Amino acid sequence: MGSGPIDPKELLKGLDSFLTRDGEVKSVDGIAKIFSLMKEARKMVSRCTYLNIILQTRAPEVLVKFIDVGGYKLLNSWLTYSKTTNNIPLLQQILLTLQHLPLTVDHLKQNNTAKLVKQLSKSSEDEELRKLASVLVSDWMAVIRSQS
């Protein structure tokens, strides 16, 4: 009650019906609700709370539906944002959520995230993001070379 600190729990507890005890989304349309609050989450802390939910989500359909509603490209928008603003642990959160959802060869050849993240994996300052990048790049080149 009131407003002095930033309370992101108000958004997810008012919508607690679509959340679990674990913290994931119990129903695949709830993922579209999380995305709906996420795309307009005014602060870094609030939008990062939704990323944690995409990490908790164990279902294949919920992660694929997050991609389907344009969640993967929301991450691609914030990917360039967090790099230019030097938001290193925020960019990390976006990278580990990016690789947590099944980012297929299709998505790779549409958004071309592989060339962007390659610069981090090459010789960045951010050792955390660089090694994390080198993991997902090796995974992405694996699925690419197996297809074409």
Side-chain angles (χ1 to χ4, degrees):
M1 180 183 292
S3 198
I6 302 171
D7 288 88
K9 94 294 179 182
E10 295 187 65
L11 290 300
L12 292 312
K13 186 58 60 181
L15 192 73
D16 180 78
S17 311
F18 298 91
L19 287 304
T20 55
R21 191 282 301 146
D22 180 81
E24 78 170 307
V25 181
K26 63 149 58 65
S27 188
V28 72
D29 71 292
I31 269 296
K33 315 294 183 186
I34 271 59
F35 170 73
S36 184
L37 297 173
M38 181 180 174
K39 63 179 182 177
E40 60 175 76
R42 299 73 169 150
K43 199 61 63 191
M44 167 185 165
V45 60
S46 51
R47 63 181 57 194
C48 184
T49 305
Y50 303 112
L51 292 171
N52 290 211
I53 303 170
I54 311 300
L55 297 172
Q56 294 293 31
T57 47
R58 63 174 296 218
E61 61 179 275
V62 299
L63 294 174
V64 175
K65 185 59 180 178
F66 184 64
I67 301 173
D68 178 78
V69 300
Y72 73 121
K73 70 184 184 66
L74 182 65
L75 273 58
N76 297 146
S77 305
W78 298 355
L79 195 73
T80 55
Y81 164 71
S82 304
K83 191 176 72 293
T84 189
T85 55
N86 211 151
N87 278 84
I88 295 300
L90 176 56
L91 189 53
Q92 179 168 30
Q93 292 303 272
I94 297 171
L95 283 175
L96 53 79
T97 300
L98 182 70
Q99 77 192 155
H100 185 257
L101 55 80
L103 203 66
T104 316
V105 60
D106 172 77
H107 307 318
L108 304 177
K109 62 193 296 183
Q110 299 308 271
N111 57 30
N112 303 271
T113 300
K115 68 174 184 177
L116 307 176
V117 73
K118 187 185 303 301
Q119 300 185 331
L120 292 304
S121 181
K122 188 86 292 300
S123 294
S124 68
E125 55 173 71
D126 38 86
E127 59 182 285
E128 302 303 298
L129 287 58
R130 185 177 177 253
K131 65 179 180 178
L132 193 157
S134 187
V135 175
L136 52 74
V137 167
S138 183
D139 175 73
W140 293 353
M141 299 311 107
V143 306
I144 291 176
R145 67 188 173 223
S146 295
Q147 294 290 28
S148 51

